[PDB]
Amino acid sequence: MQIFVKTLTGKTITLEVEPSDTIENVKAKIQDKEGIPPDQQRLIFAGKQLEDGRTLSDYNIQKESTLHLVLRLRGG
Amino acid sequence: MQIFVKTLTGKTITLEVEPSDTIENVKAKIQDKEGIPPDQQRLIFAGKQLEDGRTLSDYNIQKESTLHLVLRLRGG
Amino acid sequence: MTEEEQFALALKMSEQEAREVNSQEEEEEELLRKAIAESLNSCRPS
């Protein structure tokens, strides 16, 4: 399937994913396209922050869904 | 973690420390780099002066925080 | 040398660092709140 991710700068990223992908795999797909370290990435969907050990189907995320990517600075 | 210390001369020193380090250990790390006796060093953070028997976590000091190093004495 | 000017300078730089750091902390907390609230209010482009 395909999903969309929106940045704080108002850019939209498109990601190819399966419902069984972890949020850690989604952070790694964003790192591969944008260079952003996974420790600096926060993903929000339907008002809920998404956790590394969970999958897209645990949040009922489906084709053409829009996620909100939050980041600032520092990694510790 | 790392912290920064600014001098009266406007130099920035970088120190490797843990939140459990005493202010006495921070004075000793400054003595090792700059040769300055701990009895002559006054350390300030967020406008508050720091005490030898306290630790960086007692002042809620975090990574890449800026401390301010005061020198000399009150008399002149 | 002078101690009083240099001392006041060190304290003043320490107060500016404290003020702006508290600003970034409040701005980041309010950003997270807004992002959650907007993810609930409208998740479509608008």
Curated annotation (Swiss-Prot), chains A, B:
Phosphoserine carried by residues: 65
Glycyl lysine isopeptide (Lys-Gly) (interchain with G-Cter in ubiquitin) crosslink location in chain: 6, 11, 27, 29, 33, 48, 63
Numbered residues of crosslink Glycyl lysine isopeptide (Gly-Lys) (interchain with K-? in acceptor proteins): 76
Resulting phenotype, residue 7 to D: Impairs ubiquitination by CRL2(KLHDC3) E3 ligase complex
Site, as annotated: Essential for function: 68
Leader sequence residues: none
Listed result of changing residue 68 to A: Decreases affinity for UBE2R2 in ECS(FEM1C)-UBE2R2 complex. Impairs ubiquitination by CRL2(KLHDC3) E3 ligase complex. Impairs ubiquitination by CRL2(KLHDC3) E3 ligase complex
PTM field: Phosphorylated at Ser-65 by PINK1 during mitophagy. Phosphorylated ubiquitin specifically binds and activates parkin (PRKN), triggering mitophagy. Phosphorylation does not affect E1-mediated E2 charging of ubiquitin but affects discharging of E2 enzymes to form polyubiquitin chains. It also affects deubiquitination by deubiquitinase enzymes such as USP30.
Residues the record marks as site: Interacts with activating enzyme: 54, 72
Entry membrane topology: Peripheral membrane protein
Residues with PTM ADP-ribosylglycine: 76
Domain of life: Eukaryota
Domain Ubiquitin-like: from-to ranges: 1-76
Residue numbers bearing the (Microbial infection) ADP-ribosylthreonine modification: 66
Outcome after substituting residue 44 to D: Impairs ubiquitination by CRL2(KLHDC3) E3 ligase complex. Impairs ubiquitination by CRL2(KLHDC3) E3 ligase complex
Localisation per UniProt entry: Cytoplasm; Nucleus; Mitochondrion outer membrane
Function summary: Exists either covalently attached to another protein, or free (unanchored). When covalently bound, it is conjugated to target proteins via an isopeptide bond either as a monomer (monoubiquitin), a polymer linked via different Lys residues of the ubiquitin (polyubiquitin chains) or a linear polymer linked via the initiator Met of the ubiquitin (linear polyubiquitin chains).
Name recorded for this polypeptide: Ubiquitin
